[PDB]
């Protein structure tokens, strides 16, 4: 797990964000960065596009791995729920299941319909 | 005459004029105003909707009252002439009526097409 893998050849400021989703810790640019006789201003400009599309790219790895962890925590949630339901259809109860949505849809947008105070009395109704 | 009534029950913002119209001295208001867990911002929004619906209400029973007031005015002058008018009948006087509201009118809005000396040398000149 702990070794760190280069790709090294024909790796572009373009095709970098690829490398590094594959699983490459970095990569070893040649040709595409400098080849002998350029400038030294062609040089600064390569560099530069890759020092770019590395942090533009590890950014948007970042915000995807953020994404990827925000997103399942709904997954627990919701199963959470369904089970909760099937536990309360046992006892013979049935709740509108598009009203369960429509409240954590409306909360967490701040526009339910229900006060925070209804919301707990109502739970302590449902207790009951 | 002098005993307060105050309506309470379904009063609102909107319908309050109607309530002091009809001769209540004000109004309780419950939960309209305020209903048990709302926030202390919907306390003090339907408050000044209630004070804005009283005052901008008030204010129109006033205006309307001082057109009354303005209007009757009217009628006893109207009288007035309509009743010296038959009395100039009886005289064998008859009196172009159109131009008589003519005077009334343009005088009223500063247009008299006669100056104040000429009215005044008119009427003397009636009276003869």
């Known amino acids: 797990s702990d070794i760190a893998v280069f790709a090294v050849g024909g790796v572009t400021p373009e ?3 690829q490398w ?3 699983g490459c810790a970095g990569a070893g640019l040649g040709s595409d960065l400098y080849r ?3 400038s ?14 590395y942090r533009e790219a590890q950014k948007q790895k970042e915000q995807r791995q953020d ?10 949630l919701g199963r959470y729920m369904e089970n909760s ?7 013979g109860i049935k ?4 009203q369960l ?5 409306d909360a967490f947008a701040d526009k339910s319909k229900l006060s925070d105070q209804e919301i707990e009395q109502t739970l302590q109704a449902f207790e009951a």
């Not at 030294?40 to 599309?53: D, I, L, M, N, S």
């Not at 709740?95 to 598009?98: N, Q």
């Not at 949505?101 to 849809?105: N, S």
């Open 101 to 105: 949505i429509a409240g954590v849809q």
């Open 67 to 76: 994404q990827k962890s925000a997103y399942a925590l709904g997954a627990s």
């Open 15 to 17: 095709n970098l964000a």
């Open 36 to 38: 002998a006789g350029q």
């Open 85 to 91: 339901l099937k536990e309360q259809e046992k006892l």
């Open 95 to 98: 709740l509108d299941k598009d």
């Open 40 to 53: 030294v201003e062609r040089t600064a400009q390569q560099a530069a596009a890759f020092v770019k599309a």
């Open 20 to 22: 590094i989703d594959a």
